[PDB]
Ligand binder design. Sequence first.
Ligand SMILES: *[C@@H]1O[C@H](CO)[C@@H](O[C@@H]2O[C@H](CO)[C@@H](O)[C@H](O)[C@H]2NC(C)=O)[C@H](O)[C@H]1NC(C)=O
Ligand SMILES: *[C@@H]1O[C@H](CO)[C@@H](O)[C@H](O)[C@H]1NC(C)=O
Ligand SMILES: *[C@@H]1O[C@H](CO)[C@@H](O)[C@H](O)[C@H]1NC(C)=O
Lengths: 68, 72
Amino acid sequence: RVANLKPRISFNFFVTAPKNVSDIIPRTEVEKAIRMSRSRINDAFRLNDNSLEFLGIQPTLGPPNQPP
Amino acid sequence: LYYNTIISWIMWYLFNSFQEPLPWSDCPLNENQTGYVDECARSSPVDYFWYRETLNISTSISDSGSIQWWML
Ligand SMILES: *[C@@H]1O[C@H](CO)[C@@H](O[C@@H]2O[C@H](CO)[C@@H](O)[C@H](O)[C@H]2NC(C)=O)[C@H](O)[C@H]1NC(C)=O
Ligand SMILES: *[C@@H]1O[C@H](CO)[C@@H](O)[C@H](O)[C@H]1NC(C)=O
Ligand SMILES: *[C@@H]1O[C@H](CO)[C@@H](O)[C@H](O)[C@H]1NC(C)=O
């Protein structure tokens, strides 16, 4: 369910159960689902993690241990 | 005597070339890989490569430490 659409290109969204409008999925579980498939949503729109931000979900991992 | 230490510093930056991400281009991670090192974020990464990864500088001229092998 999408609300508050703007020209800058911003909106809010929340996720409900498939045919139960009273059952809103909690936000901390939608944050875990987006973290699992963030690289797959970025490739579908040709954006890369700084031009598609989620405002409360920040990218974490990745050690730069280059030289052997 | 001291102009041969400036050339000692210059050829340290020459050995740390020949790699495409240069070592003074980005901040290192600390222990848990979640945030940067604290003084690399308040200062600049280049300003961090000189005072902590080349010189390992102290806070005064009174406080001195070991010989700092790489420089030697
Ligand atoms: C739709 O989802 C709501 C949850 O928001 C379900 O409501 C629960 O219903 C059970 C028994 O019917 C209660 O014990 C729970 O306390 C209710 N939850 C809340 C938060 O009050 C509702 O049953 C769902 N409807 C269908 C058809 O599955
Ligand atoms: C940061 O690393 C320390 C260990 O060096 C650890 O105890 C701490 O939990 C870590 N912080 C986070 C937010 O992971
Ligand atoms: C110099 O570097 C060593 C590790 O290479 C570190 O243990 C030491 O604390 C550093 N000196 C100062 C004054 O921070």
